[PDB]
Amino acid sequence: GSFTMPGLVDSNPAPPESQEKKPLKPCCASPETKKARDACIIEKGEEHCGHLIEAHKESMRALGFKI
């Protein structure tokens, strides 16, 4: 409500559709974050996918051996 300036304004688009994930493998990995890494490295490259690094480092924080 009423005018407000940049950085204190919700200037985001609407959120995306959710879909299913692949299962695990018989050794500990995240094959979905691997697929998403490989695809983001195709779309932009390693030094431009910091959100995907965040997702996979916090995915291995879920195993307690990364950060």
Curated annotation (Swiss-Prot):
Residue positions where N6-acetyllysine is found in the record: 22, 34
Pfam families listed in its UniProt record: COX17 (PF05051)
Show where the CHCH domain sits.
Answer: 27-67
Sequence positions bearing Phosphoserine: 18
Return the protein name: Cytochrome c oxidase copper chaperone
* Domain of life from the UniProt record: Eukaryota
- A molecular function GO annotation: copper chaperone activity
Where does the motif Cx9C motif 2 lie?
49-59
Q: Where is this region: Disordered?
A: 5-24
Give the UniProt family note: Belongs to the COX17 family.
- Please give the function described in this protein's UniProt entry: Copper metallochaperone essential for the assembly of the mitochondrial respiratory chain complex IV (CIV), also known as cytochrome c oxidase. Binds two copper ions and delivers them to the metallochaperone SCO1 which transports the copper ions to the Cu(A) site on the cytochrome c oxidase subunit II (MT-CO2/COX2).
Q: Which InterPro entries match?
A: Cys_alpha_HP_mot_SF, Cyt_c_oxidase_Cu-chaperone
- Leader peptide range in chain numbering: none
Organism of origin: Homo sapiens (Human)
The cellular component terms of Gene Ontology attached to this UniProt record, alphabetical and capped at eight, are: cytoplasm; mitochondrial intermembrane space; mitochondrion
Tissue localization of expression: Ubiquitous.
Positions bound to Cu cation: 27-28
Q: List the disulfide bonds.
A: 30-59, 40-49
Tell me which UniProt keywords the record has, alphabetically: Acetylation, Chaperone, Copper, Cytoplasm, Disulfide bond, Metal-binding, Mitochondrion, Phosphoprotein
Q: Which SUPFAM superfamilies match?
A: Cysteine alpha-hairpin motif
Q: How does it assemble?
A: Interacts with COA1. Interacts with the chaperone CHCHD4; this is important for correct folding and the formation of disulfide bonds that stabilize the structure.
Compartment(s) of residence: Mitochondrion intermembrane space; Cytoplasm
Which GO terms of type biological process are on file?
copper ion transport; generation of precursor metabolites and energy; heart development; mitochondrial cytochrome c oxidase assembly; positive regulation of cell population proliferation; positive regulation of cytochrome-c oxidase activity
